[PDB]
């Protein structure tokens, strides 16, 4: 029954509308839900705007009037120019009159702010259409009318604020370059009278609401107005004194002064420098006397969260960091400004103690700026010695686990601070360590934080000073661990001990007996059942190895053999209690060390010995499972095989090219294993259906295949002997994977096959032209059919497919020249299919392939294939690119859409296409490609955007073709087009902007 308002044959029941509206805002359940769909359809009715004036006049529901203004807004925004002229002046007079009526009635001006703000915004949308060319007295009459009442003067500040935002802050995408410039120039011409009205209100009081609304509009002006209005008036004195005292105006005034700390000023004038000093001095004075003194505990204040204290402290941090990052040099030389400089930094110190992640990052960014300058700029660090001493403690106590980005910022600041005063940093850290020992500050979180801070300054002290520091730290940490009771406490401290020693490789490298003791200790921890310890021991082991590998490969003094031989020898007992992932990390670490041995025979011997246990287990299964293939369904057998291949992956990851001897030991049997597993998966799908691909048994089998491919990928991506890859590796690999991929049902095809082929083509693609052809033959058409029905199925295959086509188009373009014409047509379809994806991985690759394909065709010259390519697919690529550019569903690819389009258009206007792009009956003979290109595009846009005039399409195409060598201007013309198609009656002269 509520669907009574959607019938516009009758007259609108205003009382019924007010009930439907309140049912949607105050109701619930199904009543609210279908009242929602009714209000949407009422609003989306193209004629509803005609019924907006009786709603705004007769309705008793402010929400109904809000919705009526929304319907008006859509009309003013999209169809204003299509209206008869008398309607435009009627709407304009109606809105002006209603706003005046709402400001006179004090109970509606006070209790209906949403409606007035929405009305002010609707008025601003009209000014964007009519002002100033058909409304040149708006600003003089706004100022005159402001002197009448206080409610109008305050409301005029709201209109001006919203006007400033629409013209300067949000115009860049919402309107054309020409229309934006027109509006900016109009406000700029008449701002002299706007600033006079604003300044008079701020100086004469007295209504707080009128003052705040005036300050809010001043905030917006500061984004663009010339500097003279700020420094050559008294307004800086008003902001930094009067308006800082009252809490009603404090928040907005602080934001205005923050923007002032960013204005474009002359760095030559000595008074502008004095005025920049003066308002900062006044602001800090008002804060110390009216808000809180410099000794106040801002951390507690922020945590109590009274009133707007949190937002004020956030705005104070923004103000101080912004001003001091730009102007602190103004305060560093004059001795009378020293206390002002240090109190301000002391407020930041107090602000930096607040428990608020995002606020801390804001202050940390400033500290980084400061301590970097004190590190490089002469005669500066001595000013801030007490500030920097406090900062050291703040950062040490707030050290985070090594957010990724936040730790790097803290480390860099702390490292700068250590350079500035090593001695002060040492005593603070040892003091904090002493307070961990006596128990006054003992905590798992506190001991970990301190250890991270100690480990972060590695490499900033002299090696000799570092030596005594490390020894003192490790000794005190060992005493801490010795004194605590329980494995929980001892594991935390032992973990911190290993973290610290892991962070000081210069110390470990100079003391082999200590380094050996560390490693032997980590091997003991690899048998610890307590959670986390085994993971920590393994992570520390590979971390230390990465930095001290040379000391494991050589024979240390008074040692009988390089320690790497001692590690490999006991590898079974060392790793016996580790989980498989931890064993793989161990083997990877050993591989790092072996690669340091540059004697080939000695490196291959260490590789053979390291791989001995997995090679023995491999030879067992290869003999056992090949005779006969039933064990490959045994759970335990599949797990052993996968863990053997993963061990090879881990070692190949750290050894790269040096891994080739071990790969040759298993390569042929591994590929045979790949075939056998592939048979069993296909057999299991046949016997049980597609659901078999989800069973544990098959997923274990696919893991084997994936790990095999990952191992091959890992070596080939890092190989140095590319010849051996081509003659030994590539051919048996293609025979093993391509046909199995092609002849499997879609649900059984491993997308990792495509990724592996991408790696092969990446490194040796220029050497295997026939191999690249066989890769396309086996995967191209069958994969395309999996992914060309929708945008959702087979997401992995989708991404790998276009990565593979991308590298083939780059490294072996001749493979596409060998495709039959029907297959090459599917190639073009698949490229355009990638345009239409919202998936960024597919979309970006698809546009890059199109751009690279055009360049591949261009470099062929005037030959039958290039000529035919243009006659067949040039306009396809032009029209498909225009489609994704203008459909509003692929905005993330605008930049690469523009460049591709610019490349296509520039080809025609550079006469790089020999053949005529038309058939010689379409158009009279002798017609240039440029003339036909404009005629094709004009017809295409006329049918795709019928609401455009012919003059708009012509002006747009004229500008676009002329600008196909200037990407920045070209893109501005596309953005202008994207604005004009959202509306009716766009000015065709807008395309003459450049």
């Amino acid at each position: 029954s509520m669907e009574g308002i959607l019938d516009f044959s009758n007259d609108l029941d205003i009382a019924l509308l007010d009930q439907v509206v309140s049912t949607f805002y105050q109701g619930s359940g199904v009543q609210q839900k279908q009242a929602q769909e009714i209000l949407t359809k009422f609003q989306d009715n193209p004629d509803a705007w005609q019924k907006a004036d009786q709603i705004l006049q007769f309705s008793t529901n402010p929400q109904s009037k809000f919705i009526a203004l929304s319907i008006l807004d859509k009309l003013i925004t999209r169809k204003w120019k299509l209206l008869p002229n008398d309607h435009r002046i009627g709407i304009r007079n109606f809105v002006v009159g209603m706003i005046i009526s709402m400001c006179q009635d004090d109970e509606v001006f006070k209790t209906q702010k949403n409606l007035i703000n929405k009305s002010d915004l609707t008025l601003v949308q009209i000014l964007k259409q009519e002002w100033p060319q058909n409304w040149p007295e708006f600003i003089p009459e706004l100022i005159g009318s402001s002197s009448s009442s206080v409610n109008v003067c305050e409301n005029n500040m709201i209109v001006l604020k919203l006007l400033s935002e629409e013209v300067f802050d949000f115009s860049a995408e919402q309107m054309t370059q020409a229309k934006a410039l027109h509006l900016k120039n109009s406000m700029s011409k008449e701002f002299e009278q706007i600033f006079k009205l604003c300044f008079q209100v701020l100086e004469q009081g007295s209504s707080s609401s009128l003052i705040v609304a005036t300050l809010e509009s001043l905030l917006r002006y500061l984004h663009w107005i010339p500097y003279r209005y700020i420094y050559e008036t008294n307004i800086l004195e008003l902001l930094s004194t009067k308006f800082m005292t009252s809490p009603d105006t404090r928040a907005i005034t602080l934001k205005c002064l923050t923007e002032v700390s960013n204005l474009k000023i002359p760095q030559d004038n000595d008074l502008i420098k004095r005025q920049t000093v003066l308002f900062f001095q006044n602001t800090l004075q008002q804060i110390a006397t009216s808000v809180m003194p410099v000794t106040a505990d801002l951390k507690a204040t922020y945590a109590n969260a009274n009133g707007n204290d949190q937002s004020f402290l956030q705005d104070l941090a923004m103000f101080l960091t912004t001003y001091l990052a730009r102007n602190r040099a103004l305060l560093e030389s004059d001795e009378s400004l020293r206390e002002l400089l240090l109190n301000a930094h002391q407020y930041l110190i107090q602000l930096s103690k607040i428990e608020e992640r995002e606020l801390f990052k804001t202050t940390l960014d400033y500290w980084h700026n400061l301590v970097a300058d004190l590190f490089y700029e002469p005669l500066k660090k001595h000013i801030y010695e007490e500030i920097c001493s406090q900062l050291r403690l703040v950062i040490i106590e707030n050290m985070v686990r090594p957010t990724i980005q936040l730790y790097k910022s803290e480390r860099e600041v702390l490292v700068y601070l250590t350079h500035l005063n090593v001695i002060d940093t040492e005593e603070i850290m040892i003091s904090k360590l002493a307070r961990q020992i006596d128990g006054s500050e003992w905590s798992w979180h506190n001991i970990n934080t301190l250890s991270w801070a100690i480990g972060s300054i590695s490499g900033t002290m002299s090696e000799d000073t570092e030596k005594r520091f490390v020894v003192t730290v490790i000794k005190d940490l060992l005493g801490l661990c010795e004194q605590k009771r329980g494995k929980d406490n001892k594991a935390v401290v032992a973990s911190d001990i290993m973290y610290v020693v892991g962070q000081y490789p210069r110390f470990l490298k100079a003391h082999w007996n200590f380094l050996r003791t560390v490693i032997l200790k980590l091997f003991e921890f690899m048998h610890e059942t307590h959670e986390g310890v085994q993971d920590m021991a393994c992570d520390t082991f590979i971390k230390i190895v990465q930095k001290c590998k040379y000391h494991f490969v050589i024979q240390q003094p008074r040692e009988s053999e390089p320690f790497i031989q001692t590690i490999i020898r006991d590898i079974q007992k060392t790793t016996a209690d580790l989980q498989p992932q931890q064993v793989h990390t161990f083997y990877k670490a050993c591989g790092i060390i072996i690669s340091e041995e540059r004697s080939v025979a000695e490196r291959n011997r260490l590789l053979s010995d390291l791989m001995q246990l997995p090679n023995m287990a491999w030879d067992t299964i290869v003999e056992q499972s090949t005779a006969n293939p039933t064990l490959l369904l045994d759970s335990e057998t599949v797990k052993i095989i996968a863990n053997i291949i993963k061990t090879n992956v881990a070692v190949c990851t750290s050894m790269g090219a040096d891994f080739y001897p071990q790969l040759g030991h298993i390569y042929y049997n591994m590929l045979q294993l790949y075939r056998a597993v592939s048979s069993m998966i296909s057999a299991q799908v046949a016997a049980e259906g597609l659901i078999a691909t989800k069973t544990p048994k098959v997923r274990g089998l696919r893991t084997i295949k994936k790990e095999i491919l990952k191992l091959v990928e890992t070596y080939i991506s890092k190989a140095r002997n590319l010849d051996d890859v081509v003659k030994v590796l590539v051919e048996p690999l293609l025979n093993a994977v391509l046909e199995d991929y092609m002849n499997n049902v879609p649900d059984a095809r491993d997308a990792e096959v495509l990724n592996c082929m991408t790696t092969v083509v990446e490194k040796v693609g220029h050497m295997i032209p026939q191999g690249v052809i066989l890769i396309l033959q086996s995967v191209f058409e069958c994969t395309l059919d999996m992914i060309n029905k929708d945008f959702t199925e087979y997401p992995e295959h989708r991404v790998e497919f276009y990565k593979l086509l991308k590298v083939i188009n780059e490294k072996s373009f001749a493979a596409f020249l060998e495709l039959p014409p029907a297959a090459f047509k599917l190639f073009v379809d698949a490229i355009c299919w990638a345009f239409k994806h919202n998936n960024r991985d597919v979309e970006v690759n698809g546009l890059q392939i199109a751009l690279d394909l055009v360049k591949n065709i261009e470099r062929m010259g005037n030959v039958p294939f290039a000529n035919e390519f243009h006659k067949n697919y040039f306009f396809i690529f032009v029209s498909e690119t225009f489609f994704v550019l203008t459909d509003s569903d692929h905005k993330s690819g605008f930049s690469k859409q523009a460049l591709l389009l610019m490349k296509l258009i520039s080809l025609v206007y550079d006469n790089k296409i020999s053949v005529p792009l038309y058939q010689e009956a379409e158009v009279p003979q002798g017609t240039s490609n440029q003339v036909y290109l404009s005629q094709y595009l004009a017809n295409m846009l006329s049918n795709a955007f019928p609401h455009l005039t012919s003059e708009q399409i012509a002006s747009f195409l004229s500008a676009l073709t002329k600008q196909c060598k200037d990407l920045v201007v070209f893109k501005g013309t596309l953005r202008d087009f994207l604005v004009q198609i959202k509306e009716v009656g766009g000015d065709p002269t807008d395309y003459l902007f450049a």
Binding site: K475, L478, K487, K490, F514, L520, F525
Partner: peptide
């Protein structure tokens, strides 16, 4: 002795009781 005692003290690092 200072770095020798450190090495011995770490050698005795044990997690149990």
């Amino acid at each position: 002795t200072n770095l020798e005692a450190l090495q011995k003290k770490l050698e005795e690092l044990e997690l149990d009781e």
